[PDB]
């Protein structure tokens, strides 16, 4: 079952955000800590288009896709991802991990159904390192 | 049971209202999260009683009937929806839906009682649509051009609000920006921008070019 | 007191419609004579400009949301 | 048997293209026309030799390389294109296509015999596609204002000109062309835009309402 | 004559649409081209800033009771 | 069979809409001329988009839809219309006159195959119409 | 004489493209040795802000057709 | 000093390269990070002018080399 992240730590995150920056050190914490449960590709979804502006949100969002296809290529190059299956039915596509896949278009909660806790992961890690190279990029 | 929203997160979400606006993302996003479980007609409109200011709440509930009666022809037009049954004795009229059916009017809990869960999702879409409508109703971007001593990041920051809280459709954002900051984004960075020895394909992308080879000044 | 409220020369619409139903809402008048008396008072109220924008409307405007849209729509920017 | 093109017709279509251009619609309306049967490889070299000048025509034989290169790909991806055949022996390479196979080089009849109808359609198609990229290629929006002098009309014609002959999808032409008629086209028409009774839709009824409540001066 | 007609420049509104409307109607024409004749001669009459008056009309009108409702209107205080 | 106009005579027809206007008998004759023979909905709208500027194209497609939209309101208000057929199925849609239905998008052939003779010349007394109420409007 | 043609200050791109590929083509090279000629005549004439502009190609450029768009798409429009 | 070195006014570009690379090359650095040194210091250091113009390198640039080629090419000549 999902549930959302509260609007009220995102919205104290987003204040940090705005008056901190992007890149001190205690606004990496922050996110670190909203990051902390493996969150759904609706979740950070949002959590990025709510705590960052409309350019960094571009960046973020193509950062996010170049992370995720070097985890599909890594994934590919080892049938053991905890993202991945043993056979090849299983294999884990960018549709999925963006959350484009069918079932999941828009619906968190059919998202959470059919994810895998690896998948979750995966992005979530994938989203912190776009984030990290993002904030290194915008000052 | 019914049971009510905190008084607190409605205070909360009515500070949020009050100082960032109504069409914020960060608005929209509270709003999404007080619109997670089914609501009844009593607390949404409690609720836009409590958020909204007077003439915002009466847009709003002109366009809230207005979904709701699209939402009717719809449920006339396929007896298999989900705030209807398969007799005829189900269909769902317009007093159900606003709840001023019988047994209804004022009371909340008699209404928990006889309204469905496809009745309660469809007033909740219904509700978060029409909110959409007058958030987008109550407050240019080809008006936009980078200023003579304006930073690039700004203009891009202003572009892209304008552009994404505006009446295209969620398909057309990213051509525009980048053409309005190819015809925009006076002639330094026009030609910057020309004179790219890649393609570049995504707003990031411009962003990111510009900002390394920008004239430092 | 509502009959006694103006739009200044200076003041946006929104802050008119706002006070104006504030304070028509919040009066001794019936439930039932609110919306008509809100109607009659943004057409002789709210200053010339908006007074023939909303006189010069092809279609019938027969709500305080509906005039208040319309009028936000068509309004001079300035 | 292998009919060539009358001279007649390819010097009006080189005249057409030498004073029109390669991007008006009139052109673009006389290449459909001249290429309506399906053209053998030779037809369609010396046609694109002689109508264009000689750099377009370098850039012609790059893209139609591309788009042909395009249309293997997917006749590989693909074993029932109407120019492959069932088993192995029959697929298409790009020989055959650009008319470079054995049998083929330089005789237009022998090519008219080994060539499939659904490879001269493809030729055909790929032909077009190169032209309009070409055209495209060889000749801002965003830029356009009414010139204080300017009549409406005129405005007008130049917008919806630099909107459709441009790189936007056919589905954003319209909305792209209100919207500028509503931020460019001088404050005077723009409050005559705004305060319009009636909600315009469409670029010619907003063209059609401006006429008539014009400013005659 | 009523393709004679001309509005003054002191002339008010009212009186040349009465003027107009007398001489339209007391003429030869027949009774079912009296009402366009009318209004196109209050477009082409009627001298420019009320015939700019009429032409930027938001709506259409088609009858001279509206179009002399909508200048009596939307007329220039003077 | 399809058979295109040539285009000698659509260019013709251009410049003279382009020197005499859309309001000359002259150019009226020209289009009469031009409309002879039942023409298809590609036919007469690639002659429009080429012989008419944009603006005014607009404005023709806008009157030709309105125009097909008060034909097919005296279709469904008679059932013997030439284009229409004496049993339910072969009554006439919009996206049949205006070239948008199925087996007919883009292709002149199949539209040619499907379409009735009453069709055409419904179709074309539309568009000869829509022409002249905007060559009225224009100017 | 193709080895004595330069783009002029004033003069367009595709017009100097235009008279130095028909100068190319219409002398006594062989067919083989068109192509290499005009892509290094591209870069050594064409006055030094497309010299540059060439020279300064993350892509590398092996066609006169793909040059001239990248020159045409890359250009100071002026 | 290797961090002390600047482009002087009057000095060309491939004096002060010679000079950067000569004192990175002959210190107390690892091999592993004289490159990057060598191309933060050509970025930082070389007056403002050669900094603008590797600024705005349409090109990423990762080498010293191809920062000198790169600077060589598109100098001001003077």
């Known amino acids: 079952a999902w549930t959302p992240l509260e609007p009220k730590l995102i919205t104290r995150?987003?204040?940090?955000?705005?008056?901190?920056?992007?890149?001190?050190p205690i606004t990496m914490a922050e996110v670190e800590?909203?990051?902390?449960?493996?969150?759904?590709?609706?979740?950070?979804?949002?959590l990025m288009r709510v705590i960052l502006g409309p350019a960094p949100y571009?960046?973020?969002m193509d950062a996010w896709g170049?992370?995720?296809?070097?985890?599909?290529?890594?994934?590919?190059?080892?049938?053991?991802?905890?993202?991945?299956?043993?056979?090849?039915?299983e294999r884990t596509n960018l549709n999925r991990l963006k959350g484009l896949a069918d079932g999941m278009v828009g619906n968190p909660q059919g998202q959470a159904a059919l994810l895998r806790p690896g998948?979750?992961?995966?992005?979530t890690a994938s989203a912190l390192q776009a984030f990290r190279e993002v904030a290194r990029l915008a000052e």
């Not at 995150?13 to 001190?24: E, P």
């Not at 800590?33 to 949002?46: E, G, I, Q, R």
């Not at 998948?119 to 992005?123: F, P, R, S, T, W």
Request: charged share 15%; proline share 7%.
């Open 13 to 24: 995150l987003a204040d940090t955000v705005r008056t901190k920056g992007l890149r001190s």
């Open 66 to 89: 170049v992370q995720l296809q070097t985890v599909i290529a890594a994934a590919t190059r080892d049938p053991r991802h905890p993202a991945n299956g043993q056979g090849r039915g």
């Open 58 to 60: 571009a960046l973020w």
């Open 119 to 123: 998948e979750l992961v995966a992005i």
């Open 33 to 46: 800590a909203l990051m902390s449960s493996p969150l759904l590709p609706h979740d950070v979804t949002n």
